[PDB]
Design an enzyme around this catalytic site. Sequence first.
Site, mmCIF file in Angstrom:
data_model
loop_
_atom_site.group_PDB
_atom_site.id
_atom_site.type_symbol
_atom_site.label_atom_id
_atom_site.label_comp_id
_atom_site.label_asym_id
_atom_site.label_seq_id
_atom_site.Cartn_x
_atom_site.Cartn_y
_atom_site.Cartn_z
ATOM 1 N N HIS A 1 -1.259 17.185 -39.241
ATOM 2 C CA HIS A 1 -0.205 16.464 -39.993
ATOM 3 C C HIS A 1 -0.815 15.801 -41.240
ATOM 4 C CE1 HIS A 1 3.323 16.442 -37.077
ATOM 5 N NE2 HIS A 1 2.421 17.267 -36.577
ATOM 6 N N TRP B 1 -4.041 31.730 -34.753
ATOM 7 C CA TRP B 1 -5.351 31.193 -34.345
ATOM 8 C C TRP B 1 -5.331 29.661 -34.259
ATOM 9 C CZ3 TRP B 1 -8.226 34.420 -38.604
ATOM 10 C CH2 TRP B 1 -8.074 35.806 -38.314
HETATM 11 CA CA LIG Z 1 -2.761 14.362 -46.231
#
Ligand SMILES: [Ca+2]
Length: 319
Positions: A47, A164
Amino acid sequence: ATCDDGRTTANAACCILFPILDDIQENLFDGAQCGEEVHESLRLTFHDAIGFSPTLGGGGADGSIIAFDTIETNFPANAGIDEIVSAQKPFVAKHNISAGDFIQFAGAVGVSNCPGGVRIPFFLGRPDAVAASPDHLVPEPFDSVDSILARMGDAGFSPVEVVWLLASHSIAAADKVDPSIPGTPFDSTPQVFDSQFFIETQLKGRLFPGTADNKGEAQSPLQGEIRLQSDHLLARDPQTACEWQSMVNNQPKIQNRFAATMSKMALLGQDKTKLIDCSDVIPTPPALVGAAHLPAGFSLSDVEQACAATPFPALTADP
Ligand SMILES: [Ca+2]
Ligand code: HEM
Ligand SMILES: [Ca+2]
Ligand SMILES: [Fe+3]
Ligand SMILES: [Fe+3]
Ligand SMILES: [Fe+3]
Ligand SMILES: [Mn+2]
Ligand code: NA
Ligand code: NA
Ligand code: NA
Ligand code: NA
Ligand code: NA
Ligand SMILES: [Zn+2]
Ligand SMILES: [Zn+2]
Ligand SMILES: [Zn+2]
């Protein structure tokens, strides 16, 4: 180079990481376990890093999700990330390294606690973030395959590289998808970095472990496990199904490709040549425990085979 307490590393600049390693192992990862905080910190690496778009801006693996937490943690796609951001922040202040470096370091240390796991290459020296990620750069579990692949491609990843990276869901759970059943894992072995995630997502869905109406959630094959619709689709879509199946019972491939692709993700928005290689500070992961299997009571016929070219491998089931 020999650091002050005697431990060794290739580049002396890396010595500063040793007190940080020791602190986070005891005080973030509960004594070097492959548990909740490891899984959260690995999610955080993504994130943070994926906030990178040549068109739309964002500086990638820059620690922006901590420096600019007020903005970023309120994006809907970041729901539940505030917890780990809050936990990591004081460590960043205490130790003398940038938030971008700390996020990737904690993720790599964490993964190294997981049996079957890998040392993700680690480079030290990212400068502080200078802008917040824009919103809408993090893929969501109700996004289409085309959407997800186009977003990840925009950040620099091929479709096989997406598969992956999603080996990360082998050591992972959801708290916000269905808030009635927080901490429900995506595979039957959320403390082992193994191929069970790729096997179990391939099974025909049977039930919902919690409620039946959650956006981005698909039926799961097992009461102890939750399934994202994004994972249901990626396992089955012609673009990605054959790569997905190729991970099953292929631990060396999972290991090699996850380390290499996590390195690429850790370096989004960064230039490896201005950083210092501190990879040898990450601990040696334990070897895999257990071998790939179908869940007890299941057979090959429960697998929704989706690779036209190659039949799903003959696994045996737990007895
Ligand atoms: Ca960032
Ligand atoms: C490619 C599209 C992806 C989608 C749609 C997606 C979606 C999700 C969702 C919905 C959750 C559960 C959040 C919650 O409700 O608590 C989550 C958890 C997680 N994700 Fe993925 N993800 C993606 C890729 C990635 C990648 C590339 C990584 C690599 C680091 C990552 C690592 C994790 C981990 C480790 C967790 C577990 C967090 C926990 O146990 O607290 N994910 N993901
Ligand atoms: Ca697993
Ligand atoms: Fe600083
Ligand atoms: Fe949580
Ligand atoms: Fe099992
Ligand atoms: Mn969690
Ligand atoms: Na210990
Ligand atoms: Na600073
Ligand atoms: Na979106
Ligand atoms: Na959708
Ligand atoms: Na498509
Ligand atoms: Zn804990
Ligand atoms: Zn938590
Ligand atoms: Zn498609």
